[PDB]
């Protein structure tokens, strides 16, 4: 009577269909697990207690198919286990929650249902499914509260939201890895009671728990005791002691039996793209601190560039001063751009990997979704960085040169953003990705036509400058600023062999090549955390 018991025992969202089964027969795992064999049916709750897991992968991961090669046989619903069969019939809830902070529970559930339910279902059916999922896990009092890690919800509430997300498509087999990790005693008791109530229907729920101290062991239906990969007991927990005393190993008074026995040893692509871009926009436009920091740094750099090369006053800006100003305008943005893009990409790697492995989308709509989601704030950044400096430096007046400069800066920064995206998708860690990105950036910086004259390069630096967007940006700015004012200064230099539209097409081709590289990296390389 120490725990809360004024709860509702009604089932609002049950499973409709045939009962599911799971069979493991003489399974052995290497690179530990020896002679694992059990049989569970729908309607029962199996908890694997003890020291389970050889290395970085748990027992649930090796029985579900992840992870190191198995040497047994697993049967799912009478049929042998297979990756597509596991994806279609088995749902997994890990111990690390990965949800968007700027979203609420209802919006996230609606997005997951729209990305999971078939296209033939109407909006009313999706709304009814979301309402049933909310009422089943008693999340009606927090359906309009954000899941931000920001106050947001609590730990148990976030776990319930994750379980509801993984339970929206009505799975027949559910698996949980440490659901009560980092929760309070009452919260863990309530979560175990909720999982037991979910197992009360027509579902097969498996749970992995390390230490069921006092009540988690008492609320269990079926338990599996493991020691160094070897099973000891398999059956009802309430009789476990009665089994051990039947062999000659009694449990002492005032001692947990578990620890004492452990230490002894459809819908389509366009719809998915629309939902992804809408979710990304809704999650990005609600992050006030990040947008404010980006705008502040953009305005700071732009205004300090404008004030350092202030063209108004007594003396006007010279030729070399204008060249240095254009080179700095071209070469200062990439650092902050790459840093922000790499940080934003590595802040979503685990979530992207989980969404790609669980089968929501397959690297088709995510690409264009991320592009069109980064497009608007990047364009605002480009405006704030490029337009309130053209007037401070007192450059060539007019509308066409100003618009051409703005478009060239926008295209160059977009190419830099795509390059940073590709660098993030190519390497698994933040440090090596940032190092390779800064190396490429400094290589393209040295390949410019401002420091080494763009002519003292024999074969390789010239070929690098041929694919360097900074050199093309500097040449385009020089042609916009000095041509038809004027051509002889560009003629004595080597910045007059390529017209404006040619430079624009070269920048577009470089952006397309970087996009192709990013797509190949996303499709052929796993985004493992």
């Amino acid at each position, epitope marked *: 009577r120490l725990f809360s018991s004024e709860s509702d*025992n009604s089932l*609002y969202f049950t499973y409709s269909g045939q009962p599911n089964t799971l069979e493991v027969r003489d399974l052995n795992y290497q690179v530990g697990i020896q002679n694992l064999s059990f049989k569970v049916r729908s309607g029962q709750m199996l908890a694997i207690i003890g020291s389970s897991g050889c290395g970085r992968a748990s027992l649930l991961d090796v029985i579900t198919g992840r992870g190191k090669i198995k040497s047994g046989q697993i049967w799912i619903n009478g049929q042998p286990s297979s990756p597509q069969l596991v994806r279609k019939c088995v749902a997994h809830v890990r111990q690390h929650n990965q949800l968007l902070p700027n979203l609420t529970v209802r919006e996230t559930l609606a997005f997951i249902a729209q990305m999971r339910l078939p296209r033939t279902f109407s909006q009313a059916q999706r709304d009814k499914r979301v309402e049933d999922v909310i009422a089943e896990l008693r999340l*009606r*009092q927090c359906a*309009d509260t954000r899941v931000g890690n920001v106050r947001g919800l609590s730990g148990g509430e976030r776990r319930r939201v994750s379980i509801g997300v993984q339970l929206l498509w009505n799975p027949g087999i559910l698996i949980l890895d440490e659901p009560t990790s980092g929760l309070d005693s009452f919260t863990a008791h309530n979560l175990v009671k909720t999982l037991s109530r979910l197992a009360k229907g027509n579902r097969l729920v498996l749970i992995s728990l390390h230490q069921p101290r006092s009540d988690i062991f008492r609320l269990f239906d079926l338990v599996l005791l493991m020691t160094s990969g070897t099973p000891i007991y398999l059956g009802a927990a309430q009789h476990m002691v009665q089994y051990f005393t039947a062999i000659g190993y009694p449990c002492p008074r005032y001692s947990n039996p578990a620890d004492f026995y452990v230490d002894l040893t459809m819908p389509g692509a366009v719809q998915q793209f629309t939902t992804l871009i809408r979710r990304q926009i809704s999650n990005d436009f609600r992050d006030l601190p990040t947008l404010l920091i980006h705008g502040a740094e953009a305005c700071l750099m732009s205004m300090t560039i404008g004030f350092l090369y202030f063209g108004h006053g007594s003396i006007q800006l010279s030729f070399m001063d204008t060249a240095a100003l254009l080179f700095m305008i071209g070469a200062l943005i990439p650092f902050n751009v790459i840093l922000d893009v790499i940080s934003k990409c590595y802040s979503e790697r685990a979530m992207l990997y989980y969404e790609l492995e669980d089968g929501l989308y397959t690297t088709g709509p995510y690409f264009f979704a991320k592009i069109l989601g980064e497009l608007p704030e990047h364009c605002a950044y480009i405006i704030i960085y490029g337009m309130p400096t053209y007037w401070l430096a007192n450059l060539r007046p007019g509308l066409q040169p100003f618009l051409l400069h703005f478009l060239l800066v926008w295209l160059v920064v977009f190419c830099c953003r795509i390059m940073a995206l590709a660098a993030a998708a190519l390497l698994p860690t933040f440090h090596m990705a940032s190092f390779f990105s800064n190396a490429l950036y400094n290589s393209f910086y040295l390949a410019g036509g401002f420091m080494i004259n763009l002519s003292s390069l024999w074969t390789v630096p010239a070929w690098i400058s041929k694919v360097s967007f900074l050199r093309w940006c500097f040449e385009g700015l020089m042609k916009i600023q000095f041509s038809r004012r004027g051509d002889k200064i560009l003629s004595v230099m080597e910045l007059d062999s390529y017209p404006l539209y040619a430079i624009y097409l070269i920048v577009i081709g470089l952006s397309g090549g970087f996009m192709v590289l990013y797509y190949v990296s996303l499709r052929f390389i796993k985004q493992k955390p």
Partner: antibody, heavy 114, light 105 residues
């Protein structure tokens, strides 16, 4: 969707009584069935609930009448039955028979005075 | 969760607009419904989820939410509006009803 109640009367304290609720126009096994009384001094209080086929026809009652009121259902004729024991202490009401509680109290009946 | 309904009594006539208020002690996230009890004894739900209306109800009733106060507004008062009104919450167990409102004209 029609709900009609019957079986009301006047009974001295210490006895027992059984009210009936006839349903029409929907599946009786796929929906909840609730008894919600309304005494005159009271405003509105739900007393009994019976779940659908998915919950093994489980029943539940509030702490005010836990132990004396028993709800049952007949699926052959789709009839709710409410058996009250030791009435008339403070159990004088206009008991109503409703369909859904968790999805909003909709399609109310007419109520019978006890 | 205690539901405070206002007002307990109100006087109006043909053509005017009435607005009843229901306040919850906790957060229900818009999971509120409105029940109407006719003088004969017929009870019927008019609005569910506090924003959507049922089928077969006149379009003069509507519901809104300001902060923590759920407001049921009925416009173009007619003779069909002499009854009792209650607000009901179903987001938490057990379900609790409102205090009541005697809409008399």
């Amino acid at each position: 969707v029609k709900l009609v109640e019957s079986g009301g009367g006047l009974v001295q304290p210490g006895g027992s009584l059984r009210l009936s609720c006839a349903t029409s126009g929907f599946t009786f096994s796929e929906f909840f069935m609730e008894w919600v009384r309304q005494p005159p001094g009271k405003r509105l209080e739900w007393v009994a609930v019976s779940r659908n086929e998915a919950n093994d026809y489980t029943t539940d009652y509030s702490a005010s009448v836990k132990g004396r009121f028993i709800v049952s259902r007949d699926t052959s004729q789709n009839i709710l039955y409410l058996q009250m024991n030791a009435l008339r202490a403070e159990d004088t009401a206009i008991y109503y028979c409703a369909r859904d509680a968790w999805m909003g109290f909709d399609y109310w009946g007419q109520g019978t005075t006890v | 969760i205690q539901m405070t309904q206002s007002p307990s009594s109100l006087s109006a006539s043909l053509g005017e607009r009435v607005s009843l208020t229901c306040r919850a002690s906790q957060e229900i996230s818009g999971y509120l419904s409105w029940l109407q009890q006719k003088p004969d004894g017929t009870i019927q739900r008019l609005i569910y989820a506090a924003f959507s209306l049922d089928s077969g109800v006149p379009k003069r009733f509507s519901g809104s939410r300001s902060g923590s106060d759920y407001s049921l507004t009925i416009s173009s008062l007619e003779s069909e509006d002499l009854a009792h009104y209650y607000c009901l919450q179903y987001a938490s167990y057990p379900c609790t009803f409102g205090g009541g409102t005697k809409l008399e004209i």
